[PDB]
């Protein structure tokens, strides 16, 4: 039978504020367990929540960046549940009045772009951390209370690939706002996936599953790929339908059943009395809206329609705000657009990945990069020499020209100077010159060698050879001297 794959993604983003969400303790902590807490984080008797102002502004910014309708009236609610890393026995979150609602992002999978709706974006606090150690668990509340925004997509995703595309675009847009570093490997970006299949023709769904432990963009797509197939088989095998919570296995690529949900978790959601309501006025929204820079979609559109760059180039260059800013700053310095695009997409990104280092943390600048590109544009520096200079420039900065000559990497290709080397070679190697006229061996090879030595390995091989042959051929003459 044919079926529709319906997928929804629940994403969490850690805001990189200085202090926690409802507590004044630091949002960033060290290695010592429970060294980053206060009576609030510890859920001591009598403590109260004090909401972080920057967190709200940043949540608003992210929501706007996702094209959402921003609430005018908003409040927090308690999500009640008992767990060691959730000391108050309730997580302060938002239920019916989220900061943002009904947004969307466009993705690219095959051919035409598809718009994926985003149901909501709301603020909440993160939990602590529990580590196993035998028959017991150890609780560290350093992370408890850190600012989080939950972004739930409409169930518009129709394939694992689309899920990957949604995540890549979402990550990019959020990264541009600067409210988070959004890196799954570091946990600043998290994603749980919900999937269920519906045989075409009718409206009933097969079993529904919530997938956990998807710790990367690839594991998300791969987890969904396996689940989609497992569910397909269950659909065809007439297996039992139900609400499942499964955990993805990285060392196998499968999904294991964690539990068979019976009914629905009851979090007894109710409005938080300790935090007064939020009344987000026009001036406030306008103030925040003005902090949003040109986002990915808008930038690549210009790179294509204005700069004439390929859709591929426009996409890679706008993946992060820093890359995009650097690109724009470099081409304004006079560097060829196409060459700059190539180096950023290739050499630069390659260098960044190899050294696990961010662009702005290198010594490369729009200035010294444009400088290098100009030398490759006029023909002063070859791509092979570029492979030697670029890493030095990125690692220690400076300027291409200087690096190239302060290392003797300048290639001599002008017929003028090359003729000087040729003439010197002929005068200083009379016997070889004649050996050539008599074909007494490898005269040509020998002469080219002398020029290479004279020019300290700078003379253009192909051009020296040609000029050499030319002059040698013109001289089928002779003379004598004592």
């Amino acid at each position: 039978m044919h079926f529709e794959t319906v997928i929804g993604l629940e994403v969490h983003v850690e805001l990189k504020t200085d202090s926690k969400m409802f507590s004044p303790s630091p949002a960033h902590f060290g290695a010592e367990p429970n060294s980053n807490t206060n009576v609030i984080d510890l859920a001591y008797p009598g403590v109260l929540p004090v909401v972080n102002k920057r967190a709200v502004d940043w949540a608003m910014r992210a929501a706007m960046a996702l094209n959402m309708e921003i609430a005018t009236e908003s409040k927090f609610d308690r999500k009640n549940y008992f767990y060691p890393d959730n000391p108050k026995a309730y997580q302060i979150s938002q239920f019916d009045q989220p900061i943002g609602e009904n947004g969307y992002i466009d993705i690219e999978v095959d051919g035409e772009t598809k718009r994926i709706g985003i149901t909501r974006l709301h603020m909440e606090e993160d939990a602590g951390k529990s580590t196993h150690k035998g028959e017991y668990s150890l609780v560290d509340l350093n992370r408890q209370g850190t600012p989080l925004i939950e972004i739930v997509s409409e169930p518009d995703i129709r394939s694992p690939k689309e899920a990957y595309a949604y995540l890549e675009k979402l990550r990019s847009i959020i990264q541009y706002t600067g409210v988070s570093d959004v890196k799954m490997e570091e946990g600043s970006l998290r994603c749980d996936a919900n999937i269920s299949l519906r045989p075409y023709g009718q409206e009933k769904f097969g079993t529904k599953a919530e997938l956990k432990n998807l710790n990367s963009f690839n594991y998300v797509r791969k987890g969904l790929e396996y689940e989609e197939k497992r569910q397909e088989e269950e659909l065809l095998n007439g297996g039992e339908i139900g609400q499942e919570t499964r955990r993805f296995d990285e060392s196998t690529g499968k999904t294991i059943l964690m539990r068979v949900k019976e009914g629905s978790d009851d979090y007894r959601y109710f409005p938080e009395p300790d935090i007064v309501p939020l009344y987000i006025d026009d001036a406030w929204k306008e103030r925040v809206r003005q902090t949003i820079p040109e986002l990915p979609d808008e930038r690549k559109a210009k790179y294509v329609n204005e700069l004439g760059l390929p859709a591929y180039d426009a996409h890679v260059l706008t993946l992060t705000k820093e890359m995009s800013d650097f690109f724009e700053s470099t081409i304004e310095h006079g560097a060829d657009v196409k060459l700059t695009s190539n180096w950023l997409m290739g050499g630069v990104n390659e260098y960044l990945n190899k050294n696990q280092v961010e662009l702005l943390d290198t010594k490369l600048t729009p200035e010294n990069l444009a400088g290098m590109i100009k030398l490759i544009e006029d023909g002063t520096m070859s791509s092979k020499i570029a492979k030697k200079v670029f890493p030095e420039l990125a690692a220690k900065g400076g300027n291409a020209k200087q690096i190239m000559e302060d290392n003797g990497l300048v290639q001599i290709s002008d017929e003028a100077t090359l003729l000087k080397f040729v003439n010197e070679a002929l005068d200083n190697n009379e016997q070889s010159v004649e050996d050539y006229k008599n074909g007494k061996g490898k005269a040509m090879g020998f002469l080219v060698g002398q020029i290479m030595k004279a020019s300290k390995g700078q003379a253009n091989p192909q051009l020296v050879n040609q000029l050499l042959k030319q002059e040698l051929d013109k001289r089928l003459e002779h003379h004598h001297h004592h």
Binding site: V39, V50, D274
Partner: protein, 485 residues
């Protein structure tokens, strides 16, 4: 001059005029506690060592003529659900027996700043749930006016200690009448200020949207003096009101000629006892004799105060008491093996029956399928109750009526009867539901037991409440009886 029966105001004067040293004031207090509390049983943990040390400090300041503070050298008793840094705070529960806080509540930070002297913590119903203080895990406080009677609840210790001449002031907390009802039962002055007037930071929560800390004293002026010291905005409590004006004594002494007093017909309804009804009617005549205009009004949703309060407070409690799991502090069941057992056994063993009863009902009221019908419905009823007052305040300055429907009942008389005891919150719950200030002062005695008169005011209009309460007090009070008990 055993200063145990002196007013806060007079004690202040005595100390300022150097007629007694703070250290001797404290000696007198502990002598009183040793002599009288074995009977009254209002106190839990005493802070004698630190109290004596502080008084020595104040003795020195007195000698150097550097006596700053609204309550310089004034002894104070604090309800045990109010956090006191380094001093056992139990909420009268096995769950927090031996619990020593590592932070200071805001009201205590303020009282220490005004140089009051912390004497000890006061008994109360377990986790502030009850109207007789009999659910206390430690002891059953008795009414100073009749040792066979209850002191009220949940701030029974706060009312009793003041009525018994142990301290000139005490702090209590009121969620559904927990300050006013015991003040009424023990014949003392108790004020639950406007919601937001006093910080809740450091108040072990019962019902976050209803709770409020307030003072209990032997007279009206002492009460306003104390409210001045504990009120004010607090960055640690987002619900604390940004009202810097905390001058509550400025109107005391002024007359109430032309004051418009509203007497709700429902406040003298079927559940009010004949003797309480008679005393309140006489008080109304006293008010008129003072020049006030007293007319009947209707607060039609009054009858819903108890059930709305019960549902809302229980629901909130089913969340506010969830942090008690024996993991980070408090009672930890030694015989638990699994994680589920740790939570369940620590909570079932640590919590008393009334507390567990309320947690259970609240959990149910918020559960899937019942939320709209119970919790949310009650929140809408709360709106109606608040609206009742709004309409009355369009034409009246204050509302008056009995504080409690009866005089204090007997120890053991209603403790095994949950339904029955809640009936005693008939006239107090609407105040918390509406977030208004309300003060109780004695207006009579029946068979020796005090009857309370309640004045309810507009938001943050405690000044007016003290003004009218003081005038009434000049006509009737129990100021001379206390020292005679």
């Amino acid at each position: 001059m055993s200063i145990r029966y002196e007013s806060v105001e007079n004690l202040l004067t005595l100390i300022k005029d150097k007629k007694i040293k703070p250290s001797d004031v404290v000696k007198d207090i502990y002598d009183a506690i040793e002599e009288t509390d074995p009977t009254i049983k209002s106190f839990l943990a005493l802070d004698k060592e630190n109290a004596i040390k502080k008084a020595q400090e104040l003795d020195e300041l007195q000698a150097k003529d550097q006596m700053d503070g609204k309550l310089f050298g004034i002894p104070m008793g604090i309800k045990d659900n109010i956090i006191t840094n380094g001093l056992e705070t139990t909420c009268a529960s096995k769950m927090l027996e031996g619990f020593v806080p590592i932070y200071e509540s805001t009201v205590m930070e303020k009282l220490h700043k005004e140089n009051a002297v912390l004497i000890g913590k006061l008994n109360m119903d377990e986790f502030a749930m009850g109207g007789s203080t009999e659910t206390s895990y430690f002891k059953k406080t008795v009414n100073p006016f009749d040792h066979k009677a209850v002191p009220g609840g949940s701030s029974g210790g706060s009312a009793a200690a003041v009525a018994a001449g142990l301290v000139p002031l005490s702090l209590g907390s009121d969620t559904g009448g927990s300050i006013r009802q015991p003040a009424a039962y023990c014949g003392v002055v108790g004020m639950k200020p406007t919601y937001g007037r006093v910080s809740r930071f450091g108040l072990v929560a019962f019902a976050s949207s209803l709770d409020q800390i307030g003072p209990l004293t032997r007279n009206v002026k002492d009460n306003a003096i104390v409210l001045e010291a504990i009120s004010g905005a607090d960055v640690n409590d987002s619900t604390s009101a940004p009202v810097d004006d905390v001058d509550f004594t400025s109107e005391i002494g002024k007359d109430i000629k032309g004051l418009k007093v509203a007497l709700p017909k429902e406040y003298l309804g079927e559940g009010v006892a004949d003797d309480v009804k008679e005393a309140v009617q006489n008080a109304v005549e006293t008010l008129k004799s003072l020049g006030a205009v007293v007319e009947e009004v209707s607060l039609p949703n009054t009858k819903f105060g108890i059930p709305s309060y019960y549902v809302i407070a229980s629901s909130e409690a089913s969340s506010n008491l969830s942090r008690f799991d024996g993991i980070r502090y408090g009672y930890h069941s030694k015989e638990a093996h699994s994680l589920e057992e740790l939570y369940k056994m620590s909570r079932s063993e640590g919590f008393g029956k009334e507390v567990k009863r309320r947690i259970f009902l609240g959990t149910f009221a918020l559960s899937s399928g019942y939320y709209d019908a119970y919790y949310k419905k009650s929140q809408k009823v709360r709106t109606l109750i608040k609206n009742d007052f709004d309409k009355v305040f369009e034409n009246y300055d204050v509302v008056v009526g009995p504080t409690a429907p009866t005089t204090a009942f007997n120890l053991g008389e209603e403790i095994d009867d949950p339904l029955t005891m809640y009936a005693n919150d008939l006239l107090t719950t609407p105040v918390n539901l509406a977030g208004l200030p309300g003060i109780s002062v004695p207006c009579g005695q029946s068979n020796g037991r005090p009857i309370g008169l309640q004045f309810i005011g507009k938001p943050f209009d405690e000044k007016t409440l003290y003004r009218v309460a003081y005038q009434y007090e000049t006509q009737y009070n129990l100021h001379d009886v206390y020292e005679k008990l």
